[PDB]
Amino acid sequence: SHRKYEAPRHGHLGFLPRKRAASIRARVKAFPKDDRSKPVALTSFLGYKAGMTTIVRDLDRPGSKFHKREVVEAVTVVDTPPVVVVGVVGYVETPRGLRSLTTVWAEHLSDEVKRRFYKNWYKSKKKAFTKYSAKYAQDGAGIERELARIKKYASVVRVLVHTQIRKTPLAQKKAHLAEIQLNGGSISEKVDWAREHFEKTVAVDSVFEQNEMIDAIAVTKGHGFEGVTHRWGTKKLPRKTHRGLRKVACIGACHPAHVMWSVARAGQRGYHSRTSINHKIYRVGKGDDEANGATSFDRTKKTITPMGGFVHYGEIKNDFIMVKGCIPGNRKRIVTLRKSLYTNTSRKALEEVSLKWIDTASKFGKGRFQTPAEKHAFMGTLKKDL
Amino acid sequence: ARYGATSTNPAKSASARGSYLRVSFKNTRETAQAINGWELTKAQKYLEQVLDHQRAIPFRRFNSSIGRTAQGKEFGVTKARWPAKSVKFVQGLLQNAAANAEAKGLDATKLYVSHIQVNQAPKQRRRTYRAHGRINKYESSPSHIELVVTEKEEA
RNA sequence: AUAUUGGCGAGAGACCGAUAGCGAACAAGUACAGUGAUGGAAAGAUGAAAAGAACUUUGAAAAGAGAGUGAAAAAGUACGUGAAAUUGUUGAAAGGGAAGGGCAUUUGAUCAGACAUGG
RNA sequence: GUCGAAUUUGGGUAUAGGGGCGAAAGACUAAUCGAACCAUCUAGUAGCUGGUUCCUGCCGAAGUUUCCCUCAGGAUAGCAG
RNA sequence: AGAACUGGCGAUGCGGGAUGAACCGAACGUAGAGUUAAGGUGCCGGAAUACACGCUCAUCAGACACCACAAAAGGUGUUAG
RNA sequence: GCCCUGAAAAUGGAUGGCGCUCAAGCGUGUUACCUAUACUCUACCGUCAGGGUUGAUAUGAUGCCCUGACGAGUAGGCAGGCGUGGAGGUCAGUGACGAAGCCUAGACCGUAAGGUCGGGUCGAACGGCCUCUAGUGCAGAUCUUGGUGGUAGUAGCAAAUAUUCAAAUGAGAACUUUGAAGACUGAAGUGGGGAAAGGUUCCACGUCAACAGCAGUUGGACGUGGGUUAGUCGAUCCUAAGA
RNA sequence: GUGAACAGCCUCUAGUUGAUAGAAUAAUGUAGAUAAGGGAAGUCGGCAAAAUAGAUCCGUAACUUCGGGAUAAGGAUUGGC
RNA sequence: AGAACUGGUACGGACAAGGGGAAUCUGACUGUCUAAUUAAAACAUAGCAUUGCGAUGGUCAGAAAGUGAUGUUGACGCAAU
RNA sequence: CUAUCUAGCGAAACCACAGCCAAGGGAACGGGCUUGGCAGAAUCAGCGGGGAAAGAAGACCCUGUUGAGCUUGACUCUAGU
RNA sequence: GCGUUGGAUUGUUCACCCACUAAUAGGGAACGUGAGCUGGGUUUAGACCGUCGUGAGACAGGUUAGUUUUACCCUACUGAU
RNA sequence: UUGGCGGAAAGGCCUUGGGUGCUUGCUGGCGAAUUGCAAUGUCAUUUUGCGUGGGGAUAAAUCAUUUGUAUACGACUUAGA
Numbered sequence A: 001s002h003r004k005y006e007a008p009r010h011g012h013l014g015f016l017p018r019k020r021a022a023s024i025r026a027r028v029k030a031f032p033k034d035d036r037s038k039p040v041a042l043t044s045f046l047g048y049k050a051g052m053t054t055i056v057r058d059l060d061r062p063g064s065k066f067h068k069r070e071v072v073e074a075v076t077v078v079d080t081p082p083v084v085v086v087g088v089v090g091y092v093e094t095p096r097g098l099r100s101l102t103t104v105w106a107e108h109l110s111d112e113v114k115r116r117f118y119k120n121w122y123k124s125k126k127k128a129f130t131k132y133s134a135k136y137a138q139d140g141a142g143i144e145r146e147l148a149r150i151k152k153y154a155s156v157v158r159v160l161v162h163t164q165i166r167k168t169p170l171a172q173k174k175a176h177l178a179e180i181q182l183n184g185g186s187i188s189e190k191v192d193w194a195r196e197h198f199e200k201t202v203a204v205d206s207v208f209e210q211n212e213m214i215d216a217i218a219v220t221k222g223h224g225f226e227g228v229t230h231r232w233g234t235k236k237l238p239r240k241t242h243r244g245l246r247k248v249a250c251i252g253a254c255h256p257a258h259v260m261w262s263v264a265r266a267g268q269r270g271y272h273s274r275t276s277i278n279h280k281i282y283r284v285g286k287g288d289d290e291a292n293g294a295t296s297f298d299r300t301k302k303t304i305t306p307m308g309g310f311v312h313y314g315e316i317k318n319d320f321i322m323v324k325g326c327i328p329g330n331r332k333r334i335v336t337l338r339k340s341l342y343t344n345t346s347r348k349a350l351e352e353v354s355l356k357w358i359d360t361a362s363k364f365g366k367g368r369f370q371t372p373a374e375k376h377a378f379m380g381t382l383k384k385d386l
Numbered sequence B: 001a002r003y004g005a006t007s008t009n010p011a012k013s014a015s016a017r018g019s020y021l022r023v024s025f026k027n028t029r030e031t032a033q034a035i036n037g038w039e040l041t042k043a044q045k046y047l048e049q050v051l052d053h054q055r056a057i058p059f060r061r062f063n064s065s066i067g068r069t070a071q072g073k074e075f076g077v078t079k080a081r082w083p084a085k086s087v088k089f090v091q092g093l094l095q096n097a098a099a100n101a102e103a104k105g106l107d108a109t110k111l112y113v114s115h116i117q118v119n120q121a122p123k124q125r126r127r128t129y130r131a132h133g134r135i136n137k138y139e140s141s142p143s144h145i146e147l148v149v150t151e152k153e154e155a
Numbered sequence C: 001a002u003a004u005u006g007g008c009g010a011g012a013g014a015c016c017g018a019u020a021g022c023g024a025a026c027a028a029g030u031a032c033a034g035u036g037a038u039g040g041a042a043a044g045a046u047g048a049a050a051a052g053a054a055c056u057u058u059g060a061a062a063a064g065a066g067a068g069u070g071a072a073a074a075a076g077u078a079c080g081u082g083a084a085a086u087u088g089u090u091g092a093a094a095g096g097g098a099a100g101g102g103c104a105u106u107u108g109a110u111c112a113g114a115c116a117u118g119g
Numbered sequence D: 001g002u003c004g005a006a007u008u009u010g011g012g013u014a015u016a017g018g019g020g021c022g023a024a025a026g027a028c029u030a031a032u033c034g035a036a037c038c039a040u041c042u043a044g045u046a047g048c049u050g051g052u053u054c055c056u057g058c059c060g061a062a063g064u065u066u067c068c069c070u071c072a073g074g075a076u077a078g079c080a081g
Numbered sequence E: 001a002g003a004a005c006u007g008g009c010g011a012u013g014c015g016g017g018a019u020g021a022a023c024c025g026a027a028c029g030u031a032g033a034g035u036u037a038a039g040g041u042g043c044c045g046g047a048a049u050a051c052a053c054g055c056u057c058a059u060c061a062g063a064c065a066c067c068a069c070a071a072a073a074g075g076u077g078u079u080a081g
Numbered sequence F: 001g002c003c004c005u006g007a008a009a010a011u012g013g014a015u016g017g018c019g020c021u022c023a024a025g026c027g028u029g030u031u032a033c034c035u036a037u038a039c040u041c042u043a044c045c046g047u048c049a050g051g052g053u054u055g056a057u058a059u060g061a062u063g064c065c066c067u068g069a070c071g072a073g074u075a076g077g078c079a080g081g082c083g084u085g086g087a088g089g090u091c092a093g094u095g096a097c098g099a100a101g102c103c104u105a106g107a108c109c110g111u112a113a114g115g116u117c118g119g120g121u122c123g124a125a126c127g128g129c130c131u132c133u134a135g136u137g138c139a140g141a142u143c144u145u146g147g148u149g150g151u152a153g154u155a156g157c158a159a160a161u162a163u164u165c166a167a168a169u170g171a172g173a174a175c176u177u178u179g180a181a182g183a184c185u186g187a188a189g190u191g192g193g194g195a196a197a198g199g200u201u202c203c204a205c206g207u208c209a210a211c212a213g214c215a216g217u218u219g220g221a222c223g224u225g226g227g228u229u230a231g232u233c234g235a236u237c238c239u240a241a242g243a
Numbered sequence G: 001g002u003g004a005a006c007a008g009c010c011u012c013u014a015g016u017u018g019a020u021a022g023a024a025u026a027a028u029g030u031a032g033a034u035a036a037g038g039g040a041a042g043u044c045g046g047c048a049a050a051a052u053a054g055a056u057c058c059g060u061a062a063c064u065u066c067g068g069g070a071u072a073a074g075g076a077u078u079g080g081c
Numbered sequence H: 001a002g003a004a005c006u007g008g009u010a011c012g013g014a015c016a017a018g019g020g021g022a023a024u025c026u027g028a029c030u031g032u033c034u035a036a037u038u039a040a041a042a043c044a045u046a047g048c049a050u051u052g053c054g055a056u057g058g059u060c061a062g063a064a065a066g067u068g069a070u071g072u073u074g075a076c077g078c079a080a081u
Numbered sequence I: 001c002u003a004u005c006u007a008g009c010g011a012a013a014c015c016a017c018a019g020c021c022a023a024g025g026g027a028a029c030g031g032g033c034u035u036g037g038c039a040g041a042a043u044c045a046g047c048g049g050g051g052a053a054a055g056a057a058g059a060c061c062c063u064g065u066u067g068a069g070c071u072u073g074a075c076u077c078u079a080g081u
Numbered sequence J: 001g002c003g004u005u006g007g008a009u010u011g012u013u014c015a016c017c018c019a020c021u022a023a024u025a026g027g028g029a030a031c032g033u034g035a036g037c038u039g040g041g042u043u044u045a046g047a048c049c050g051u052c053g054u055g056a057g058a059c060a061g062g063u064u065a066g067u068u069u070u071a072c073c074c075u076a077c078u079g080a081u
Numbered sequence K: 001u002u003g004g005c006g007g008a009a010a011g012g013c014c015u016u017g018g019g020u021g022c023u024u025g026c027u028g029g030c031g032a033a034u035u036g037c038a039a040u041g042u043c044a045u046u047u048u049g050c051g052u053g054g055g056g057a058u059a060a061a062u063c064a065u066u067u068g069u070a071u072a073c074g075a076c077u078u079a080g081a
């Protein structure tokens, strides 16, 4: 008989069901609308999130109390070593949807990839793509034939790529394999780009540049079975309530004589797929760079890796994407990073940014110093040393 | 003498019993079917592994609310367990059989368990004291086990 | 001459047949309950006869498996027969949120009624 | 709450069911109390509730009349065999 | 809620009203063949997507007694008068 | 007239549903077609009625035979029958060469209550027909006694700080013994005795089927034995409320 | 031993180490704790919780049956050597 | 009791251990009761008042009695409110 | 410490038959009926919508020519006096 | 489509006042929601007052104190093989 | 066998060159019964097991152990020649 006071519902009904995701690698369910007049290039990228840290920069926002003013900002660094094209897929429009027509694989797939196709690699004969490699024995033919087919019938073209997980700190030897949409020109021009890159490598400075807003697809950290209070933000019952209070008092009226699909119930929290959008690119890391962590203002020779190493992750030997704020998923997990599905003119999205300093202290504790150098200079010579 | 229905050649076979045994009828029932039709050593070797929590027993009837195990897969099942007292009993009867087949002069290497069946024995009755000065039965459900091993036949 | 659900001694029954008949066919006013007056059960049947399974064998044993006794172990001091509910095994079949039922037929299983005519 | 007194308490003794005991709650009087417990009178009475055990064949209703401390019941006439 | 006459339900299945005590049709031994009632005949569904003259177009049409409702008042919609 | 406005309610829905627009809608008319346990003809069962007929003539005279009509049913009435314990009579009835009883998607008879038979199982008695007699038929009564399920290998076996190593014994050891460690009770005790009450629980040996809601080689258990010594400790004597 | 102390805590003599056990640490629980800023806005109601607390010295209101109120309130102090 | 020295200004260091204050209603107080839903403002109480009775008596017990309670009493008493 | 998983041990309540809904009608709030939606083995932890969930033949109310506790110038009596 | 609030007094729904606010709309879902809570009110037994009554007792009068059981089943729902 | 085309599920379509059987375009030589006057008659295509002769290819998943980006148990994610 009408709730006494109004309140909004708890939770969003469009992130249902609140179950555990299938893959740990979240799917890209959409790729940007292809402009087939720009050069061919990947539209997303594979990487492993490493951790977070702090930035400083002036602001460029005319009309803000903080315009031409320093702001500090949290950023997350995802470990993004170049990716390797090992194949191509041909999709055809049908009255039942897109369809994979054929797939053409590269001649030599590394163990990193080969591994993926196995559950007990160590005791397997590693026969993976051995008879497919024979297709290349001929002048071309069987491979040339299927490559000709995609050129004739496919309506969209995706490359297969995979992480070089070995370049990273992770114990996982098995590499992550993903399809990515080619958005350069002609369908012909596409598979060509793809064949030309077989077994070869692609870096992230060829997809994403600075000041770019990107989206970030990923599987959320898991927390197992959760009560309705923390899972839904449901209110906490009075203290006097018999039979506990991290429940909700009314699972439903009498009619419908059925617990309804929309009232909040205990169960899984976490490990959900989220596509998170409009994350702006603050720095694109060069792996070879000894000055990853430095600035045109702070010129000291340091890399992105914090002192002590990224906690629970390790060190950043490689190219990396620095994104503003945060990203779904936790450290070590794979993250597809994807170009925007639209052309944002947020002003907040057109702002060119230039960092002034990058916090490089330890995260494993209340870090005081940025470089081992600086610790020394400040504390002086210790009982060890010399 | 007088087992259940048997479709075996009594001369290529030896049998074994055990009656009024204090072991969960349901529980042991379940382990009985677990070897029902097995080659004697396969069964023995596997029953032994069950004690080791290396393999399990599929619980297929008497099984509501049993926990799930990874070791059920083998038999296409999610609820399995490891009823030690049931294996331990069943074993000793698998032992008798084998001892008797030999005594009968049968080829150990041909032996397989052609019949195995547990019935309910007469209940054993203990008392439990319930709240508000009440009383309730606390009962043991004994079993009757019986089995038979047989030379497999050669074409 | 009359009375007699008590005592003794007897002759009977269109009575009952072990949830019946007295509460008790039995170590029954017993076992057990209650401070106490009181309350008060369950419980009969191996076989003609123990001939109650010598002996061998697996077992720590209880027992099992042979053997043996017996007219019978489809009688093993759990014991005549041994129903039902309920249960294991074997065999047959069916099963997209009950099952079961009615008329009809397919299909499978099963079962019949027929018999006497010259060689 | 109270804790050196209208104190707590063992045993012995006394009070017995329309009776006791009650610094009074109809409290307590053997898990029983606005009348204990036990047997008998007792198969207490019930216009009220529940059940009421085999087949088939034929016929087949009334809820209306009169009277009743009559109104969830009877008598009475009708309907029925 | 309460009377009058009659027919029903109750006590009674069958066919129709999707459904349903009470409407409509029709009351019943076991059956075959025919014909019908009330009601139906695009498909569910047995039976003319039959014949004939009009009417109606609804950004809320309408579609069958009991029956599962609609009224005053209005319309330069359209029809006949 | 039809159509439009007037026309607002709570799960998502109802010309029965689908769907239908010169209708598959509304008004009217013409034919054909579908179909009830009803109507028409016929077989069969029964009930009721009318008639014929043991005249000497084999087997029912409450019978045989011919003819017509009818058949719903609660509560209730009557009738004809089925089944059970025991009784009189009779088949000189069945039976250890197998009575009765039980089991059997085997057979036959009856509209039915039921009857009959095969196979199996069993082991000492039992039928039919005329009559007699009743402690004479179950689905129910929160019926009685007993037996059994689903629930379910489920609820549970979470108060009292806490266990560990090794040896020994044993078929067998988380749980028994000895050793070591770690700890508790902390003298308002988890210490040492008693009163009520119990009654052998004490002690030794043997010992594990049941019992100790895991276990057991351990026990306050099971079997077998042993044990309680007074002039001085009590009773006993005394008197108390009372009896 | 600490201490006002037969309190609490720790120990000696004596006695137990007996209350099914193993593996994990989801939810929700039962029992124990803690929370930035605000400080009863929660609620029938400060329910629950929190805060105070020994001792020495100073200090101490209305009223009063002159006995009390009163540890009123409010303060300072406290180890070791 | 006093003084000096000393420390991350701590020191009844665990344990132990009153929150306070201003009012209204209400029973004076300590005490009592609904064992197992009520601990209260209810019952009690000291205090106050009233009533009966000089023993051949008052109140009470018993079926009855050569019976019994108060009474080992006697109004500064016993009994009843 | 639980719940949870494992060895051992192992109950109880309750049960016409059962277990997905929407509308309809219906004893006027169906799991079953009618018309639709639909509909795929076997399952584990949670849950408190629904099984008008279960738990004592409704304690309220009314009826019964059914009680009992209690009161009184109701009726009829009685120990006593 | 989306929001519709913080509080003082009251058991309250209601009422009313303060205050904020874009606005502080009205209603349903067994007068939604007690094996979800709470238990303040009402409405068992204790108790005080007022009115009524000779009284036991009564009050649609005021007041105070008064035990809130079970899910492990099926379905639903949430998660999980 | 020569060319081509078909990707909506193309798994099919057209086209070139001979080879081979049939040819009812036409003209001849034979056959059929008795399956007795209908019953009873052309065998289609699914799977699945076995048999031969030829061509061919010569792995993995689970249990267990391990990681902790995961977790109540299953499951998830790693790792091990």
Ligand SMILES: [Mg+2]
Residues within 6 Å of the ligand: A001, A002, A003, A004
């Ligand atoms: Mg409400």
Ligand SMILES: [Mg+2]
Residues within 6 Å of the ligand: A002, A003, A006
């Ligand atoms: Mg609202």
Ligand SMILES: [Mg+2]
Residues within 6 Å of the ligand: A013, A014, A015, A016, A017
């Ligand atoms: Mg969603």
Ligand SMILES: [Mg+2]
Residues within 6 Å of the ligand: A226, A227, A228, A229, A230, A231, A246
């Ligand atoms: Mg939570």
Ligand SMILES: [Mg+2]
Residues within 6 Å of the ligand: none
């Ligand atoms: Mg949050």
Ligand SMILES: [Mg+2]
Residues within 6 Å of the ligand: A240, A241, A242
């Ligand atoms: Mg509570």
Ligand SMILES: [Mg+2]
Residues within 6 Å of the ligand: A228, A247, A248, A249, A250, A251
């Ligand atoms: Mg809840």
Ligand SMILES: [Mg+2]
Residues within 6 Å of the ligand: A234, A235, A236, A237, A247, A248, A249
């Ligand atoms: Mg809540």
Ligand SMILES: [Mg+2]
Residues within 6 Å of the ligand: A052, A076, A325, A326, A327, A328
């Ligand atoms: Mg981030």
Ligand SMILES: [Mg+2]
Residues within 6 Å of the ligand: A363, A364, A365
């Ligand atoms: Mg940190």
Ligand SMILES: [Mg+2]
Residues within 6 Å of the ligand: B019, B144
């Ligand atoms: Mg047996």
Ligand SMILES: [Mg+2]
Residues within 6 Å of the ligand: B061, B062, B063, B064
């Ligand atoms: Mg089951």
Ligand SMILES: [Mg+2]
Residues within 6 Å of the ligand: B065
């Ligand atoms: Mg379950």
Ligand SMILES: [Mg+2]
Residues within 6 Å of the ligand: B065
């Ligand atoms: Mg459970």
Ligand SMILES: [Mg+2]
Residues within 6 Å of the ligand: B128, B129, B130, B131
């Ligand atoms: Mg108990």
Ligand SMILES: [Mg+2]
Residues within 6 Å of the ligand: B133
């Ligand atoms: Mg008790």
